[PDB]
Write a protein that binds this ligand. Sequence first.
Ligand SMILES: O=C(/C=C/c1ccc(O)cc1)c1ccc(O)cc1O
Length: 275
Amino acid sequence: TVFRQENVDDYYDTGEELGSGQFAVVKKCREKSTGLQYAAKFIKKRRTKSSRRGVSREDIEREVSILKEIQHPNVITLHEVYENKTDVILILELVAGGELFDFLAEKSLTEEEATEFLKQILNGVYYLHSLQIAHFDLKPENIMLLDRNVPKPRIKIIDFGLAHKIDFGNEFKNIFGTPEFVAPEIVNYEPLGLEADMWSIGVITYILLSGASPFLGDTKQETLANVSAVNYEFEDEYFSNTSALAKDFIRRLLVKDPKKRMTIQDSLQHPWIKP
Ligand SMILES: O=C(/C=C/c1ccc(O)cc1)c1ccc(O)cc1O
């Protein structure tokens, strides 16, 4: 599938950089014809078939195809796609209030603050899972606020670089996500489905409530070994005023067997969340 091959600089001006990775960089931009503002994600293309640098065209096309299907308040909306010899450029909805991760470092949250964020994450994932889309990369870096200066900030899941459609219940591909947040089946290179996102939500909830990461070791191999063994606990020093029901919600998500883990529907009906 081919994208717009006019020079993106003829239609947009770029500004502040928003984010930066191994093969992508995201810049604030403004569309010249409308004045409207977006985030331009420049993804570096692979320059040969066998190369390890850049992103394969198959991977780029998959991310674009997923972004084209989604429209929901808690997920980013794709506006346009351009390409040239070196990059694919996704013109994405601008979400300018910063990371949940950085806003977190400003203060642990109360349970109400945490559940106000978490309910929006769950609504966005419920939409994705309803469409059989696994995100495969849920972590604080990928959740950003629309305005960080209100008591109840609104959030969006802002990247879809590892997302896959799960039309057979599972996909058998390796997901090199972030060790602290990946489920045991990712660590163990097993078939993956929507359940892996529910584990990541469990990790995110533990961090929202405590400020501490449940499986983090001193090296990436220790973190991965801890994930696979489900080696975590609720430290009293961090959880002593956290309700038992909040702990129960986490415990039912940080479950090794994906079949026994809460689903997104289960998570919305759990007594900690259900109104
Ligand atoms: O930082 C990133 C995304 C940021 C962002 C900010 C605001 C938006 O509106 C949209 C995206 C980012 C995304 C993908 C990646 O591989 C590496 C990265 O560093």
